[PDB]
A = this chain, B = another copy of it.
Amino acid sequence: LALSLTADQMVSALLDAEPPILYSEYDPTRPFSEASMMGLLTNLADRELVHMINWAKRVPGFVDLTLHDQVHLLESAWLEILMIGLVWRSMEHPGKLLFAPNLLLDRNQGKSVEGMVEIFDMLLATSSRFRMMNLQGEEFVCLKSIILLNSGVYTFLSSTLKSLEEKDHIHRVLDKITDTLIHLMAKAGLTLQQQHQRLAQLLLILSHIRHMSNKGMEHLYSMKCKNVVPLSDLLLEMLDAHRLHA
């Protein structure tokens, strides 16, 4: 089970889970002014979401949950997960956001859609903070897994027995990931004092990621989607997989 993993096994499993880096799909022989920025981002987000499900399935402990709870966690966290990936990808590109290898964007190109230069600035600032902390790949994957498990864990509908057991499992997995982060820092030579301080610094950045996600969602809710099937239904279909292709 998830709960019996060692730290090294946890880090291995998260590293092995990582999604691919996708490309934005645009005709590179076309004038950039012809492209809808929000169209490009929307299309990339949609493609990434499929791969996010696959990742989430390989995060230790996630598939032990109910499909309803898997959906709730992802519905809560999907923008935060996208954002932390972006910030990670952008760390070695000061002043820009690497949305994809062919879509590296600066502040000014943020000014296309209204509201978004604000968000862009907040993401660049986060990438800068990670650069300054020298965030490691191994710490990044722990943090992105924390988002997935933590973001929606306070907003379950119920205190039924099953819901109680699900929450308890989530918290125990999160406790394992904290242990792993501390293990990594201890292994890198940090003092115990430095370990707890860094743990706090990293977890407090997750509050800023939540903030950024909320402000993004505030824009996305503001202008009607594609008379969509609800995101929760789309998630259920991707997650509610059959075993026929085994």
Candidates B122, B197, B199; contact of A154 at CB < 8 Å:
B122
Q: Contacts A196-B196, A210-B207, A215-B214 given: A201-B171 contact, CB under 8 Å?
A: yes
Q: Is A155 close to B, CB under 8 A?
A: yes
Q: Is A70 close to B, CB under 8 A?
A: no
Q: Residues of B contacting A215 with CB < 8 Å?
A: 214
Contact with B along A71-115 (1 / 0, CB 8 A): 000000000000000000000000000000000000000000000
Query: Is A155 in contact with B200, judged by CB distance below 8 angstroms?
Result: no
Q: Residues of B contacting A203 with CB < 8 Å?
A: 200, 203-204
Q: Residues of B contacting A214 with CB < 8 Å?
A: 210-211, 214-215, 218
Distance, CA A218 to CA B213, complexed state (A): 13
Candidates B126, B199, B207, B218; contact of A199 at CB < 8 Å:
B199
**A146 — nearest CB in chain B belongs to which residue?**
B204
Query: Is A207 in contact with B122, judged by CB distance below 8 angstroms?
Result: no
Query: Is A154 in contact with B196, judged by CB distance below 8 angstroms?
Result: no
Within 8 A of B (CB), among A42-90: none
Q: Is A24 close to B, CB under 8 A?
A: no
Q: Is A184 close to B, CB under 8 A?
A: no
**A221 — nearest CB in chain B belongs to which residue?**
B218
Within 8 A of B (CB), among A169-207: 171, 174-175, 178-179, 182, 192-193, 195-197, 199-201, 203-207
User: Which of A129, A201, A204, A208 has most chain B Cβ within 10 Å?
Assistant: A204
25 residue pairs A–B, Cβ–Cβ below 8 Å: A122-B154, A125-B154, A146-B204, A150-B204, A150-B207, A154-B205, A171-B201, A174-B200, A175-B197, A175-B200, A178-B197, A178-B199, A178-B200, A182-B196, A199-B200, A200-B203, A203-B203, A204-B206, A206-B207, A207-B210, A210-B210, A210-B211, A211-B214, A214-B218, A218-B218
